[PDB]
Coordinates of C-alpha atoms and ligand atoms in Angstrom, one line a residue:
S1 CA 113.0 -265.9 -3.1
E2 CA 112.4 -269.0 -5.0
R3 CA 112.6 -269.1 -8.8
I4 CA 109.3 -271.1 -9.2
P5 CA 107.5 -270.2 -5.8
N6 CA 105.6 -273.1 -4.5
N7 CA 104.6 -274.7 -1.1
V8 CA 105.0 -278.2 -2.4
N9 CA 108.7 -278.5 -1.8
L10 CA 109.3 -278.5 -5.4
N11 CA 113.2 -278.4 -5.0
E12 CA 113.2 -281.7 -3.3
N13 CA 111.8 -283.3 -6.3
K14 CA 114.8 -282.7 -8.6
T15 CA 113.6 -284.5 -11.8
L16 CA 110.1 -282.6 -11.5
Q17 CA 111.9 -279.2 -11.0
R18 CA 114.0 -279.8 -14.0
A19 CA 111.0 -280.5 -16.2
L20 CA 109.0 -277.5 -15.2
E21 CA 112.2 -275.3 -15.7
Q22 CA 112.7 -276.9 -19.1
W23 CA 109.0 -276.0 -19.8
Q24 CA 109.1 -272.5 -18.6
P25 CA 110.7 -270.7 -21.4
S26 CA 108.0 -272.1 -23.9
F27 CA 105.4 -270.8 -21.5
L28 CA 107.2 -267.6 -21.7
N29 CA 107.3 -267.4 -25.4
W30 CA 103.6 -268.4 -25.5
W31 CA 103.0 -265.4 -22.8
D32 CA 104.9 -263.0 -25.2
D33 CA 103.2 -264.1 -28.4
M34 CA 99.7 -264.6 -27.0
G35 CA 99.4 -262.4 -23.8
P36 CA 98.3 -258.8 -23.5
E37 CA 99.1 -257.1 -26.7
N38 CA 102.0 -254.6 -26.7
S39 CA 102.3 -255.0 -23.0
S40 CA 106.0 -256.2 -22.8
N41 CA 107.4 -252.9 -21.4
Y42 CA 104.5 -252.0 -18.9
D43 CA 104.7 -252.0 -15.2
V44 CA 101.4 -253.1 -13.8
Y45 CA 100.3 -252.9 -10.2
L46 CA 99.5 -256.6 -9.7
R47 CA 98.7 -258.8 -6.8
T48 CA 101.0 -262.0 -6.7
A49 CA 100.3 -265.0 -4.6
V50 CA 103.3 -266.3 -2.3
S51 CA 101.3 -268.8 -0.2
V52 CA 97.8 -270.0 0.8
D53 CA 97.8 -268.3 4.2
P54 CA 94.4 -266.7 3.9
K55 CA 95.9 -263.7 5.8
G56 CA 99.1 -262.9 3.9
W57 CA 98.7 -264.8 0.7
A58 CA 98.8 -262.2 -1.8
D59 CA 101.1 -259.0 -1.9
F60 CA 101.0 -256.0 -4.4
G61 CA 103.5 -254.2 -6.4
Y62 CA 104.6 -253.2 -9.9
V63 CA 105.9 -255.8 -12.3
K64 CA 106.3 -256.4 -16.0
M65 CA 104.1 -259.3 -16.8
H66 CA 106.9 -261.1 -18.7
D67 CA 108.4 -261.3 -15.0
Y68 CA 105.2 -262.2 -13.1
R69 CA 106.1 -264.8 -10.5
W70 CA 103.9 -267.6 -11.5
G71 CA 103.9 -270.1 -8.8
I72 CA 102.4 -273.6 -7.8
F73 CA 100.2 -273.2 -4.6
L74 CA 98.2 -276.4 -3.0
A75 CA 95.6 -275.9 -0.1
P76 CA 97.3 -277.4 2.9
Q77 CA 97.5 -281.3 3.2
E78 CA 95.0 -282.7 5.6
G79 CA 96.0 -285.8 7.7
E80 CA 94.1 -288.9 7.1
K81 CA 91.8 -287.3 4.6
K82 CA 89.1 -289.8 3.3
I83 CA 87.4 -290.2 0.0
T84 CA 83.8 -288.7 0.4
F85 CA 81.6 -290.2 -2.7
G86 CA 81.5 -293.0 -4.9
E87 CA 82.6 -296.7 -4.8
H88 CA 85.7 -295.8 -2.9
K89 CA 83.8 -293.6 -0.1
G90 CA 85.7 -294.1 3.4
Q91 CA 89.0 -295.1 1.7
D92 CA 92.1 -292.8 2.1
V93 CA 92.4 -290.3 -0.6
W94 CA 95.0 -290.9 -3.3
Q95 CA 98.5 -289.3 -3.7
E96 CA 98.9 -290.9 -6.9
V97 CA 96.4 -291.7 -9.6
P98 CA 95.4 -295.5 -9.8
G99 CA 96.2 -297.0 -13.1
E100 CA 92.7 -297.7 -14.0
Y101 CA 91.6 -294.2 -13.7
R102 CA 94.9 -292.4 -15.0
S103 CA 93.9 -291.7 -18.6
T104 CA 90.4 -290.3 -17.5
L105 CA 91.9 -288.0 -14.7
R106 CA 94.4 -287.0 -17.3
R107 CA 91.9 -285.9 -19.8
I108 CA 90.0 -284.0 -17.0
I109 CA 93.0 -282.2 -16.0
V110 CA 94.1 -281.2 -19.5
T111 CA 90.7 -279.9 -20.4
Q112 CA 90.5 -278.0 -17.4
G113 CA 93.9 -276.5 -18.2
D114 CA 93.2 -275.8 -21.7
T115 CA 90.5 -273.1 -20.9
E116 CA 93.1 -271.2 -19.0
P117 CA 95.6 -270.0 -21.8
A118 CA 92.4 -269.9 -24.0
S119 CA 90.9 -266.9 -22.0
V120 CA 94.1 -265.0 -22.2
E121 CA 94.3 -265.5 -26.0
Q122 CA 90.8 -264.4 -26.4
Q123 CA 91.4 -261.4 -24.3
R124 CA 94.6 -260.2 -25.3
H125 CA 93.6 -257.2 -27.7
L126 CA 91.2 -255.8 -25.1
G127 CA 94.0 -253.5 -23.5
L128 CA 94.0 -251.3 -26.7
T129 CA 90.6 -250.2 -25.8
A130 CA 90.6 -250.1 -22.0
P131 CA 87.9 -247.7 -20.6
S132 CA 90.3 -246.9 -17.7
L133 CA 93.7 -247.6 -16.0
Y134 CA 91.8 -249.3 -13.2
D135 CA 89.9 -251.6 -15.8
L136 CA 93.0 -252.2 -17.8
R137 CA 94.9 -253.2 -14.5
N138 CA 92.1 -255.6 -13.6
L139 CA 92.2 -257.3 -17.0
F140 CA 95.8 -257.9 -16.8
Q141 CA 95.3 -259.2 -13.2
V142 CA 93.0 -261.6 -14.6
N143 CA 95.2 -262.6 -17.3
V144 CA 98.3 -263.4 -15.0
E145 CA 95.9 -265.5 -12.9
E146 CA 94.6 -267.5 -15.9
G147 CA 98.3 -267.9 -16.6
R148 CA 99.0 -269.2 -13.1
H149 CA 96.1 -271.7 -13.5
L150 CA 97.9 -273.1 -16.6
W151 CA 100.9 -273.5 -14.4
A152 CA 98.8 -275.4 -11.8
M153 CA 97.4 -277.8 -14.3
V154 CA 100.8 -278.3 -15.9
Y155 CA 102.4 -279.0 -12.5
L156 CA 100.1 -281.9 -11.9
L157 CA 100.6 -283.3 -15.3
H158 CA 104.3 -283.3 -14.9
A159 CA 104.3 -284.3 -11.3
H160 CA 101.7 -287.2 -11.6
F161 CA 101.2 -288.2 -15.2
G162 CA 104.8 -289.1 -16.4
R163 CA 105.7 -288.8 -20.0
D164 CA 102.2 -288.3 -21.1
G165 CA 101.8 -285.7 -18.7
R166 CA 104.9 -283.8 -20.2
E167 CA 103.4 -284.3 -23.6
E168 CA 100.1 -282.7 -22.6
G169 CA 101.9 -279.8 -21.0
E170 CA 103.4 -279.2 -24.6
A171 CA 100.4 -279.7 -26.5
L172 CA 98.4 -277.1 -24.1
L173 CA 100.8 -274.3 -25.7
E174 CA 100.3 -275.8 -29.2
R175 CA 96.5 -275.3 -29.4
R176 CA 95.3 -271.7 -29.8
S177 CA 91.9 -270.1 -29.5
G178 CA 90.2 -269.9 -32.8
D179 CA 93.1 -271.7 -34.7
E180 CA 92.1 -273.6 -37.8
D181 CA 94.4 -276.6 -37.5
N182 CA 94.6 -276.6 -33.6
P183 CA 91.7 -274.9 -31.8
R184 CA 91.3 -274.8 -28.2
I185 CA 89.0 -277.9 -26.9
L186 CA 85.8 -276.1 -25.7
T187 CA 83.6 -274.0 -28.0
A188 CA 83.0 -271.1 -25.6
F189 CA 87.0 -270.8 -25.2
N190 CA 87.5 -270.9 -29.0
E191 CA 85.2 -267.9 -29.8
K192 CA 85.9 -264.1 -29.9
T193 CA 85.7 -261.9 -26.8
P194 CA 85.3 -258.7 -29.1
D195 CA 84.8 -255.9 -26.6
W196 CA 84.7 -255.0 -22.9
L197 CA 81.1 -255.8 -22.5
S198 CA 81.7 -259.1 -23.7
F199 CA 84.8 -259.5 -21.3
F200 CA 82.8 -258.4 -18.4
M201 CA 80.0 -261.0 -19.2
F202 CA 82.6 -263.5 -19.7
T203 CA 84.2 -263.2 -16.3
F204 CA 80.7 -262.9 -14.7
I205 CA 79.4 -265.9 -16.3
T206 CA 81.9 -268.1 -18.1
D207 CA 84.7 -268.0 -15.5
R208 CA 81.7 -269.0 -13.1
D209 CA 81.7 -272.3 -15.0
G210 CA 85.3 -272.5 -14.0
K211 CA 84.2 -272.1 -10.5
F212 CA 81.8 -274.9 -10.4
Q213 CA 84.0 -277.2 -12.6
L214 CA 86.9 -276.6 -9.9
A215 CA 84.6 -276.9 -7.0
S216 CA 83.6 -280.4 -8.3
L217 CA 87.3 -281.4 -8.8
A218 CA 88.1 -279.7 -5.4
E219 CA 86.3 -282.9 -4.0
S220 CA 88.4 -285.5 -6.0
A221 CA 89.7 -288.5 -4.3
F222 CA 93.0 -287.4 -6.3
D223 CA 94.1 -285.2 -3.6
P224 CA 96.8 -283.2 -5.3
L225 CA 94.2 -282.2 -7.8
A226 CA 91.8 -281.6 -5.0
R227 CA 94.2 -279.2 -3.3
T228 CA 95.1 -277.3 -6.3
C229 CA 91.4 -276.6 -7.2
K230 CA 90.7 -275.6 -3.7
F231 CA 93.3 -272.7 -4.0
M232 CA 92.3 -271.8 -7.6
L233 CA 88.7 -271.2 -6.3
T234 CA 89.9 -268.2 -4.2
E235 CA 91.4 -266.7 -7.3
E236 CA 88.5 -267.5 -9.4
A237 CA 86.6 -265.3 -6.9
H238 CA 88.4 -262.2 -7.9
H239 CA 87.4 -262.9 -11.7
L240 CA 83.7 -263.3 -10.9
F241 CA 84.0 -259.9 -9.2
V242 CA 85.6 -258.0 -12.1
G243 CA 82.7 -259.3 -14.3
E244 CA 80.0 -258.6 -11.8
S245 CA 81.0 -255.3 -10.8
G246 CA 82.0 -254.4 -14.4
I247 CA 78.5 -255.0 -15.7
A248 CA 77.3 -253.5 -12.5
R249 CA 79.0 -250.3 -13.3
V250 CA 77.9 -250.3 -16.9
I251 CA 74.3 -250.5 -15.5
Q252 CA 75.0 -247.9 -13.0
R253 CA 76.1 -245.3 -15.7
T254 CA 73.2 -246.4 -18.2
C255 CA 70.8 -245.5 -15.3
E256 CA 72.5 -242.2 -14.6
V257 CA 72.0 -241.1 -18.0
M258 CA 68.4 -242.4 -18.0
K259 CA 67.7 -240.2 -15.0
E260 CA 69.6 -237.1 -16.4
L261 CA 67.9 -237.3 -19.8
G262 CA 64.5 -238.3 -18.2
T263 CA 64.1 -241.0 -20.8
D264 CA 64.3 -244.8 -21.5
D265 CA 64.2 -244.2 -25.3
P266 CA 67.1 -246.4 -26.4
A267 CA 67.9 -244.1 -29.5
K268 CA 68.4 -241.3 -27.0
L269 CA 70.5 -243.2 -24.7
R270 CA 72.6 -244.4 -27.6
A271 CA 73.1 -240.7 -28.8
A272 CA 74.3 -240.1 -25.3
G273 CA 76.9 -243.1 -25.6
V274 CA 75.6 -245.4 -23.2
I275 CA 74.5 -248.9 -23.5
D276 CA 70.7 -249.1 -23.0
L277 CA 69.6 -251.7 -20.5
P278 CA 67.7 -254.0 -23.1
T279 CA 70.8 -254.4 -25.2
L280 CA 72.8 -255.3 -22.0
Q281 CA 70.0 -257.9 -21.4
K282 CA 70.8 -259.4 -24.8
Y283 CA 74.4 -259.8 -24.0
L284 CA 73.4 -261.6 -20.8
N285 CA 71.3 -264.0 -22.7
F286 CA 74.1 -264.5 -25.1
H287 CA 76.7 -265.3 -22.6
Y288 CA 74.5 -267.3 -20.4
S289 CA 73.3 -269.6 -23.0
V290 CA 76.6 -270.2 -24.5
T291 CA 78.2 -270.9 -21.2
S292 CA 75.6 -273.2 -20.2
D293 CA 76.4 -275.7 -23.1
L294 CA 79.7 -276.2 -21.2
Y295 CA 78.3 -278.5 -18.5
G296 CA 77.7 -281.1 -21.1
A297 CA 74.7 -283.2 -22.1
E298 CA 72.1 -283.5 -19.3
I299 CA 72.2 -287.4 -19.3
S300 CA 75.7 -289.0 -19.3
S301 CA 77.3 -292.2 -18.7
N302 CA 80.7 -290.5 -18.5
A303 CA 79.7 -288.1 -15.8
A304 CA 78.2 -291.0 -13.6
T305 CA 81.3 -292.8 -14.2
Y306 CA 83.7 -289.8 -12.8
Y307 CA 81.6 -289.5 -9.6
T308 CA 81.3 -293.4 -9.0
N309 CA 85.2 -293.6 -9.5
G310 CA 85.8 -290.6 -7.1
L311 CA 87.3 -288.5 -9.7
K312 CA 84.9 -285.6 -9.6
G313 CA 82.2 -284.9 -6.9
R314 CA 79.1 -282.7 -6.9
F315 CA 79.2 -278.9 -5.9
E316 CA 79.7 -278.8 -2.2
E317 CA 79.3 -282.7 -2.0
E318 CA 79.6 -282.8 1.9
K319 CA 76.3 -280.7 2.4
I320 CA 74.3 -283.0 0.3
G321 CA 72.0 -285.2 2.6
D322 CA 72.3 -288.5 0.9
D323 CA 74.3 -291.6 0.7
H324 CA 77.0 -290.0 -1.6
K325 CA 76.8 -293.1 -3.8
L326 CA 73.5 -292.6 -5.6
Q327 CA 72.9 -296.3 -6.8
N328 CA 69.1 -295.6 -5.7
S329 CA 68.9 -291.8 -6.1
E330 CA 67.1 -289.7 -8.7
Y331 CA 67.3 -286.3 -10.2
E332 CA 64.7 -284.3 -12.1
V333 CA 65.7 -283.1 -15.3
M334 CA 63.6 -281.6 -18.5
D335 CA 62.8 -283.3 -21.6
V336 CA 61.4 -282.4 -25.1
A337 CA 58.8 -284.6 -26.4
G338 CA 57.2 -283.1 -29.7
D339 CA 55.6 -280.0 -29.1
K340 CA 56.2 -280.0 -25.2
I341 CA 58.7 -279.4 -22.6
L342 CA 58.3 -281.9 -19.8
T343 CA 59.9 -282.8 -16.4
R344 CA 61.0 -286.4 -15.6
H345 CA 63.2 -288.3 -13.0
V346 CA 66.3 -290.2 -14.1
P347 CA 68.9 -292.0 -12.2
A348 CA 70.8 -289.3 -10.4
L349 CA 74.5 -290.4 -11.3
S350 CA 73.3 -290.2 -15.2
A351 CA 72.3 -286.5 -14.4
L352 CA 75.5 -284.9 -12.7
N353 CA 76.0 -282.6 -15.6
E354 CA 72.6 -281.2 -15.3
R355 CA 73.0 -280.8 -11.3
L356 CA 76.1 -279.0 -11.8
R357 CA 74.5 -276.8 -14.3
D358 CA 71.5 -276.0 -11.9
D359 CA 73.9 -275.0 -9.4
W360 CA 75.6 -272.5 -11.6
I361 CA 72.3 -271.3 -12.7
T362 CA 71.4 -270.5 -8.9
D363 CA 74.7 -268.8 -8.5
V364 CA 74.4 -266.6 -11.6
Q365 CA 70.8 -265.8 -10.7
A366 CA 72.3 -264.6 -7.3
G367 CA 74.3 -262.0 -9.1
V368 CA 71.7 -260.8 -11.4
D369 CA 69.6 -260.2 -8.3
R370 CA 72.3 -257.8 -7.3
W371 CA 72.5 -256.1 -10.5
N372 CA 68.7 -255.4 -10.4
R373 CA 69.1 -253.4 -7.2
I374 CA 70.5 -250.7 -9.4
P375 CA 67.6 -249.9 -11.5
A376 CA 65.4 -250.5 -8.5
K377 CA 67.1 -247.5 -6.6
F378 CA 66.5 -245.3 -9.6
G379 CA 62.9 -246.4 -9.4
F380 CA 63.1 -247.7 -12.8
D381 CA 60.9 -250.8 -13.8
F382 CA 63.7 -252.6 -15.8
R383 CA 64.7 -256.0 -14.4
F384 CA 67.5 -258.4 -15.8
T385 CA 66.4 -262.1 -16.1
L386 CA 67.7 -265.4 -17.1
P387 CA 66.4 -267.0 -20.2
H388 CA 64.9 -270.5 -19.8
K389 CA 67.7 -273.1 -19.8
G390 CA 66.5 -274.5 -23.1
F391 CA 67.2 -271.1 -24.9
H392 CA 69.9 -270.8 -27.6
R393 CA 71.6 -274.2 -26.8
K394 CA 74.0 -276.3 -28.8
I395 CA 74.5 -279.1 -26.5
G396 CA 72.1 -281.6 -25.1
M397 CA 68.2 -282.1 -25.4
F398 CA 67.1 -278.5 -26.4
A399 CA 69.8 -278.4 -29.4
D400 CA 67.3 -279.3 -32.1
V401 CA 64.7 -277.0 -31.1
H402 CA 64.2 -273.3 -30.5
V403 CA 63.1 -272.1 -27.0
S404 CA 62.1 -268.5 -26.3
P405 CA 63.7 -266.8 -23.1
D406 CA 60.2 -267.1 -21.5
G407 CA 60.3 -270.8 -22.0
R408 CA 58.0 -271.7 -25.0
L409 CA 58.9 -274.0 -28.0
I410 CA 58.8 -271.7 -30.8
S411 CA 58.5 -272.1 -34.7
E412 CA 61.5 -271.5 -37.3
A413 CA 59.7 -268.4 -38.4
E414 CA 59.0 -267.0 -34.8
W415 CA 62.8 -267.6 -34.0
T416 CA 63.9 -266.0 -37.4
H417 CA 61.6 -262.8 -36.7
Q418 CA 62.1 -262.6 -33.0
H419 CA 65.6 -263.7 -32.0
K420 CA 66.9 -260.1 -32.7
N421 CA 65.2 -259.0 -29.4
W422 CA 67.1 -261.8 -27.6
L423 CA 70.5 -261.8 -28.8
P424 CA 73.0 -259.1 -30.0
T425 CA 72.6 -258.2 -33.6
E426 CA 75.3 -257.4 -35.9
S427 CA 74.0 -253.8 -35.6
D428 CA 74.1 -254.0 -31.5
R429 CA 77.7 -255.2 -31.8
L430 CA 78.7 -252.4 -34.1
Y431 CA 77.1 -250.0 -31.8
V432 CA 79.1 -251.4 -28.8
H433 CA 82.3 -251.4 -30.8
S434 CA 81.9 -247.8 -31.5
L435 CA 82.0 -247.1 -27.8
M436 CA 85.1 -248.8 -27.2
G437 CA 88.0 -246.5 -27.1
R438 CA 90.8 -246.3 -24.6
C439 CA 90.7 -243.9 -21.6
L440 CA 94.1 -243.7 -19.8
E441 CA 94.2 -240.5 -17.9
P442 CA 94.4 -241.3 -14.1
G443 CA 91.2 -241.7 -12.5
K444 CA 89.1 -241.2 -15.6
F445 CA 86.5 -243.5 -17.0
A446 CA 85.1 -244.0 -20.5
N447 CA 81.6 -242.3 -20.8
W448 CA 80.0 -245.9 -21.2
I449 CA 80.8 -247.2 -17.6
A450 CA 80.7 -245.6 -14.2
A451 CA 83.8 -245.5 -11.6
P452 CA 84.2 -248.4 -9.5
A453 CA 83.2 -248.3 -5.8
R454 CA 86.7 -248.3 -4.5
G455 CA 90.3 -248.6 -5.7
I456 CA 92.6 -251.7 -5.6
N457 CA 94.5 -252.6 -2.3
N458 CA 93.5 -249.3 -0.6
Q459 CA 94.9 -247.1 -3.3
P460 CA 92.9 -244.1 -4.8
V461 CA 90.7 -244.9 -8.0
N462 CA 93.0 -242.3 -9.7
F463 CA 96.3 -244.4 -8.8
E464 CA 98.5 -245.1 -11.8
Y465 CA 97.7 -248.8 -12.0
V466 CA 99.7 -249.1 -15.0
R467 CA 102.8 -247.1 -16.1
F468 CA 103.3 -247.7 -19.9
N469 CA 107.0 -246.8 -19.9
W470 CA 106.4 -245.1 -23.6
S471 CA 109.8 -244.3 -23.7
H472 CA 111.9 -247.1 -25.5
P473 CA 115.1 -247.6 -23.6
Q474 CA 117.9 -248.9 -26.1
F475 CA 119.6 -252.0 -25.6
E476 CA 123.0 -251.6 -23.7
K477 CA 122.4 -247.8 -23.8
Ligands
FE1 FE1 91.2 -270.1 -14.6
FE2 FE1 88.8 -267.4 -14.2
OH3 O1 90.1 -269.0 -13.4

């Protein structure tokens, strides 16, 4: 019923409500310019959140995405919640940011916010080559949710950061993925997402960085941010499912053709129009290593500071069996010293980036293990693996050297001769591009990917998840 749906009593804060209503047309102009291409008249079968009530939170129906009901939804407030780590452990959580942390928390929220529209901008062309209505609908669902995450951060900026907050909300729509004068902040969000295989890896791997960053902020002493991220985690889960099941369905299809043709010869697989498993492995290597750089330098005074001040906790902070202060704790990280990769212990507070990275690696591996059930049930030997964490890194201690996927420091000549086996080549990408082509007949799936296990919201897999309204009704006519 509400114009800006929310469970935050927005209408009782009239100054804030005015400011968000003032900002909304510019969000909608951004959505129209940079959102899913040519989609202004589509009716999409979308889920929309209307609460955080884990039973009846999200309801489905057709909507044109310009009319999507983007809302602000915080996890329920908890009475007498305490801060759980850092200097301030045991004190009451903050409803407003302490002045001394204000600009730091602001930059953290803006940086998180910036990735949300960035992903929409990267993915805006994908619809033209959607391999199915089911997949097109999933893409759009991810898009409108990422749009909501921008709302979720812009709300915090306006509600808790005054004028600076408003100015950040405006600049969040002035930056643009890949733009020369005003690029998005983070490299991985500034690059192209050129085809559906990249899109599925991105939502499987890079949205998972979102998951771990958000789980760290879900711990924050700044409780409105903590409550915001806590609810976004439940949405991020859907994104991770799109990416994991997306790739799982490509692997499934490729294995079907391997069994049918009785061969694992790449040339024969490609003649049949599937993506050979070794090439899938390269895309995994590419997105995994690129995403890894997002956690930042292994050793960081800044990250020590976020923890100590109560701004950002460790993943699942409350399950960790230590003092949650870490003045006298250690953490084991790698190091490179000439022609050797070694391990060393450093003060735990200085290595929080690396700890979060390690948590993400573990989570990604759990998903790859699930992928591996597929070749295994076909009786194939192929297994997907993650490359050594030092492989293909632009950030941190491995940035000045080459590491092979199996964890050796290698020479410039070996990198130059071998990396074509490890990362997608121009020729691999051209091949994958040649498979990309829309498939919009109900219940039909492009030949490079298998059908999903089930539909959406109990609908058949052949349901018309998107109705294009190809006819162009005339103004006032
Ligand atoms: Fe997001
Ligand atoms: Fe996401
Ligand atoms: O997300």
